[PDB]
Amino acid sequence: SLQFEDKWDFMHPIVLKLLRQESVTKQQWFDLFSDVHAVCLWDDKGSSKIHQALKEDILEFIKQAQARVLSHQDDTALLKAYIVEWRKFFTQCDILPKPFCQLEVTLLGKMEDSIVRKLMLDTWNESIFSNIKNRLQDSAMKLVHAERLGEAFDSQLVIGVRESYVNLCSNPEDKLQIYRDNFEKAYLDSTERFYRTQAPSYLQQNGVQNYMKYADAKLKEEEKRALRYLETRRECNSVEALMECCVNALVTSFKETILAECQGMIKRNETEKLHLMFSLMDKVPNGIEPMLKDLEEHIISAGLADMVAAAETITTDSEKYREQLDTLFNRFSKLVKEAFQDDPRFLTARDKAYKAVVNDATIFKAENL
């Protein structure tokens, strides 16, 4: 007695437990593999009957899951109920198709290549996700906005929506299409809208120095948030696109306001502030160039000032001048080391400026009387 009618009543309860994430013994699990194989082998209608009854079991569970989720009128409660269901269901999408491996090999067309897994995700999408996706996305974005303003929440509420967009896409050629066009797009737009409002206001209330600390902190905050909420598994450029958006809203949008303080900072030997400027400005295309120009100009001006003060006594004590210049080079070489970490670009600018100091001092002509 190895026909579908003889075995299904023993198989059905295990399928139910696997869909509901209920306790299954190792005996029940391996016997299900054995029963699928026995029915597909011995019953001429075995493969057909197992596929249809399993399809009915999948469809019935999703109809029950739909009732629980769709019973919540409140968007917040709808999101909470969707995530509770999704977390369990999505996990089971990697489990339920496993005993049905023997069934799949008997079907035409045959984890991502699984007929059963595809059926699970397609039915979930058709009955649950597709009808409420825009509401789930809007609620996810509102939670990220609330988190930015200081309100903590269960991260799974946002993660679950992202996972749904990534996994419930119909395009074979572009599995990340609905994720990019909808979730990633809404995340990037809301991020851009948040900082376009916050950043100029913070800058005006707190000044450039405090703004730099704010931008650096926000960039670190957003990077951590994006690594948690956005798609990272599929090795896509999602976090890099989010960072590009943040760098543009926080640094690039106020690049000239920031750069205008470089000269004053070099003059006052504000190494920690200059180091913060270099870290922020190096994220922007050619953001370092005006800092290099400010450094070069300040070295040359300092050199010129020394020669102007030394020229009158040069024939009697030129050794004092060469010592003052040696002191000048030691002072600026230190600045390049502390503020700019001896970066090859800042070293190039430092050498060019030192060469210019020596050339200008050589050609310098004292005022004739």
CA distance 96 to 116: 8
For the chain, the distance separating the N- and C-terminal CA atoms, rounded to the nearest angstrom, is: 124
Structure tokens at 16: 């139910």
Instruction: Tell me how the structure was determined.
Output: X-ray
Question: How many angstroms separate the CA atoms of 158 and 235, rounded?
Answer: 19
For the chain, the maximum distance between any two Cα atoms, rounded to a whole number of angstroms, is 124
DSSP letter, residue 209: H
Q: Which two tokens stand for residue 242?
A: 């989010």
How many angstroms separate the CA atoms of 156 and 83, rounded? 7
Which CATH code of 2.30.30.90, 1.20.970.10, 1.10.287.130, 1.20.1310.10 fits the domain covering 1-127? 1.20.1310.10
The conformational region for residue 270 under phi > 0 = left, psi -120 to 50 = alpha, else beta, is beta
Place of tokens 């597909």: 40
What CATH number should be reported for the domain whose range is 128-254? 1.20.1310.10
Domains 1-127 and 128-254 share a fold: yes
Q: Are 353 and 299 in contact (CB under 8 A)?
A: yes
Query: 311: which DSSP letter?
Result: G
Q: Which tokens go with 316?
A: 């009697």
With vertex at residue 330, the alpha carbon angle to CA 262 and CA 276, rounded to the nearest 5 degrees, is 30
Resolution in A: 2.0
272-277 LR contacts (CB < 8 Å, sep 24+): 272/339, 273/209, 273/212, 274/335, 274/339, 274/340, 275/338, 275/339, 275/340, 275/341, 276/212, 276/213, 276/216, 277/212
Please tell me the CATH code under which domain 255-364 is placed. Answer: 1.20.1310.10
d(CA 301, CA 318): 20
SS3 368: coil
Q: Alpha-carbon distance 44 to 304, whole Å?
A: 99
Q: Which amino acid is at 204?
A: Q
| Residue 40 amino acid letter | C
How far apart CA 80 and CA 59 sit, in angstroms, is: 22
Half-sphere CA count of 265, side-chain side, radius 13 A:
23
**Cβ-based burial of 241 (10 A; exposed 0-12, middle 13-18, buried ≥19):** middle
Q: Where are the domains of the chain?
A: 1-127, 128-254, 255-364
